[PDB]
Design an enzyme around this catalytic site. Structure first.
Site, PDB file in Angstrom:
ATOM      1  N   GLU A 187     -11.479   5.710   3.785  1.00  0.00           N
ATOM      2  CA  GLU A 187     -10.418   5.264   4.740  1.00  0.00           C
ATOM      3  C   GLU A 187     -10.661   5.902   6.137  1.00  0.00           C
ATOM      4  OE1 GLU A 187      -6.369   4.503   2.697  1.00  0.00           O
ATOM      5  OE2 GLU A 187      -7.443   5.512   1.099  1.00  0.00           O
ATOM      6  N   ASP A 228       0.840  -1.220   0.000  1.00  0.00           N
ATOM      7  CA  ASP A 228       0.000   0.000   0.000  1.00  0.00           C
ATOM      8  C   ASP A 228       0.848   1.232   0.000  1.00  0.00           C
ATOM      9  OD1 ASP A 228      -2.366   1.706   0.208  1.00  0.00           O
ATOM     10  OD2 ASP A 228      -3.410   0.259   1.493  1.00  0.00           O
TER      11      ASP A 228
END
Ligand SMILES: CC(=O)N[C@@H]1[C@@H](O)[C@H](O)[C@@H](CO)O[C@H]1O
Ligand SMILES: CC(=O)N[C@@H]1[C@@H](O)[C@H](O)[C@@H](CO)O[C@H]1O
Ligand SMILES: *[C@@H]1O[C@H](CO)[C@@H](O)[C@H](O)[C@H]1NC(C)=O
Length: 606
Positions: A495, A289
């Protein structure tokens, strides 16, 4: 196989493994570590790409050539960076990645499909396949070869800001919806070995099963935090869909920022190498990520040397740097030159990256196809997104008492009707996060049909449609309305911004429902990424629909409200009574839902 200047890796008739080994055997250490490096377009230039032998580029959320860019503008950007990479000594094409997670969602005019939670509600894996198919075409319209999807997290607590990115709290549902993979990539041939990467060719994209592993199991739903569960429960709940992804040839796997019993995923060799690679037999490439290796440490970025060592030794193959490439390349070079990271590790990473690139046809079609631009926002795809939106809707109530006439379906012909609420005419709100901007946005952000637009498009010409965002009680009582449709709900998020311990919708939301439903019989359309506190909305409303984040095609909503199709969606998650119950799943012990997993009322088409 023929001219005196023949090079085997450039011969499209040769077996991928032979091409990979041929190219690998020619590469310098700088060329190898370059393949392992993925940078943001915002730091890329032709010199940078050539001089550091860069393997990959991405657009993060909102990272666009400009606002409103055409499909052609995207193709030309991508092609400019490809031309630079093709001009290196070896001419290894880059792969360009992007978050195309509910359509090609960073791009203006792209079809925006329902987010995953709503797709879970359809229980239709073939629909989801077709959505993958359409998304591949719209991603290739823009010259992009690689989509960071599907998110196969199994969200176990809806306080998580990514719960809408999970198809369901039930792993079996998540498993079924791995059909997105062969949609995006193409079906694997009959002979296929589980764990091998596959992409069919220039009209398909490489996919990404993410985020490995247990991202949906974190404590209190806190994004990127620790998942405390024994191996049995990790393997029974969080892992299974990864094996379905291997069986369907998913090209890549992205690692989670989350920890499993205190061990950072990005440093977890037992899971990444021991399990994914050595036990599942994954042969594509593992990607980090965004600053994922940085975040192995606390604070993040406080020992980048260790981050590089830990991640690469753990088994990561490509690193989403995405900005400090010179530092990444330098540190990794130094570790290899010092003997701290063996050449065998570098060669494995590069073998996997090259295997995906050759498998997908990237050396034969490195550049974009201008004839594909017109795939963007195509009507056939919008029709598909409309179907999906309608199928996602879950009818939770349809009458206050058991003796009331069912409010839905509403008649298309009535003298005067009201459409109201913050979410009735706001395309951005109905798309939610990862739409144009990273966090989504408010208002008319792209091409689509709001709920109000859809009503106006559905009703008889003699029906007068009145819009008021937040009308008072007296306005409604005095308006001579037949019925109202009122839409309210969550604002866009993505997120950690979406992590929410109260799960109560923003005002004015409830207050408008109360005002409207107090005046006239009302159908409430709740737009959310997840279950939210709903008893007060229910108490006010004649009918209430959980429409999730249905995307650009608001006619999906009215398709069911006016009875062109029946309601068929069922809850893919538990609806809680109170957030003090959480986490609460569906065989606990304190299992006491407002609506259980699988609940949903039905109507028949009129
Ligand atoms: C961090 C977070 O998501 N907090 C939300 C907050 O934005 C909102 O004002 C509050 C009302 O109780 O509900 C919760
Ligand atoms: C012959 C026919 O049209 N039957 C269906 C019936 O199965 C269903 O109970 C009803 C109300 O739900 O909708 C209609
Ligand atoms: C979880 O978040 C808490 C509270 O912010 C913090 O103390 C901790 O570092 C986080 N843990 C992990 C493993 O990310």
């Amino acid at each position: 196989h023929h001219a005196a200047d023949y090079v085997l890796y450039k011969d499209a008739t040769k077996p991928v493994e032979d091409r990979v080994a041929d190219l690998l055997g020619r590469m310098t250490l700088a060329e190898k570590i370059g393949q392992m490096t993925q940078i943001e377009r915002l730091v890329a230039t032709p010199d940078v790409l050539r001089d550091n032998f860069i393997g990959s580029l991405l657009s993060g959320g909102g990272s666009v050539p400009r606002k409103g860019a055409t499909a052609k503008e995207w193709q030309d950007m991508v092609d400019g960076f490809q031309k630079a990479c093709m001009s290196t000594r070896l001419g290894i094409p880059m792969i360009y990645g992007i978050d195309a997670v509910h359509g090609q969602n960073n791009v203006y005019g792209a079809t925006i499909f329902p987010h995953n939670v709503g797709l879970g509600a359809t229980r239709d894996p073939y629909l989801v396949k077709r959505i993958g198919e359409a998304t591949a075409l719209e991603v290739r319209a823009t010259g992009i070869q690689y989509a960071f999807a599907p998110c196969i997290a199994v969200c176990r607590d809806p306080r998580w800001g990514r719960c809408y990115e999970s198809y369901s709290e039930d792993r079996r549902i998540v498993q079924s919806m791995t059909e997105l993979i062969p949609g995006l990539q193409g079906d694997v041939p009959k002979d296929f070995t589980s764990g091998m990467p596959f992409v069919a060719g220039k009209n398909k994209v490489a996919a990404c099963a993410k985020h490995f592993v247990g991202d949906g199991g974190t404590v209190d739903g806190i994004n990127a935090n620790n998942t405390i569960i024994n191996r049995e429960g990790l393997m029974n709940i969080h892992m299974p869909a990864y094996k379905n992804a291997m069986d369907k040839g998913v090209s890549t796997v992205m690692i989670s920022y989350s920890s499993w019993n205190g061990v950072k995923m990005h440093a977890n060799q037992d899971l990444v190498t021991g399990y994914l690679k050595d036990t599942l037999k994954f042969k594509g490439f593992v990607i980090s990520d965004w600053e994922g290796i940085d975040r192995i440490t606390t604070p993040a970025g406080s020992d980048y040397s260790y981050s590089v060592k830990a991640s690469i030794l753990a088994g990561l193959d490509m690193i989403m740097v995405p900005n400090k490439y010179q530092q990444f390349i330098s540190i990794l070079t130094g570790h290899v030159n010092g003997g701290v990271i063996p050449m065998s590790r570098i060669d494995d990473a590069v073998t996997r990256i090259l295997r995906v690139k050759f498998t997908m046809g990237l050396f034969e079609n490195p550049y974009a196809d201008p004839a594909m631009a017109e795939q963007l926002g195509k009507q056939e795809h919008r029709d598909l997104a409309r179907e999906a939106a309608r199928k996602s809707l879950v009818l939770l109530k349809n009458g206050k008492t058991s003796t009331d006439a069912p409010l839905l379906p509403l008649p298309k012909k009535a003298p005067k009707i009201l459409v109201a609420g913050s979410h009735a005419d706001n395309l951005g709100y109905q798309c939610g996060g990862w739409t144009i901007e990273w966090q989504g946005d408010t208002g008319r952000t792209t091409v689509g049909t709001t709920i109000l637009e859809a009503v106006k498009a559905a009703v008889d010409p003699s029906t007068v449609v009145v819009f008021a965002e937040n009308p008072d009680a007296e306005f409604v009582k005095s308006g001579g309305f037949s019925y109202a449709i009122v839409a309210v709900g969550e604002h866009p998020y993505t997120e950690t911004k979406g992590d929410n311990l109260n799960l109560t919708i923003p005002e004015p939301g409830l207050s408008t429902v109360q005002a409207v439903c107090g005046g006239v019989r009302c159908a409430t359309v709740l737009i959310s990424g997840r279950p939210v506190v709903v008893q007060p909305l229910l108490a006010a409303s004649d009918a209430l629909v959980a429409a999730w984040l249905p995307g650009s095609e608001g006619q999906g909503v009215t398709d069911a409200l006016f009875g062109d199709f029946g309601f068929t969606g069922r809850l893919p998650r538990t609806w809680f009574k109170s957030v003090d119950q959480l986490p609460m799943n569906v065989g606990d012990a304190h299992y006491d839902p407002l609506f259980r997993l699988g609940y949903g009322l039905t109507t028949n088409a009129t």
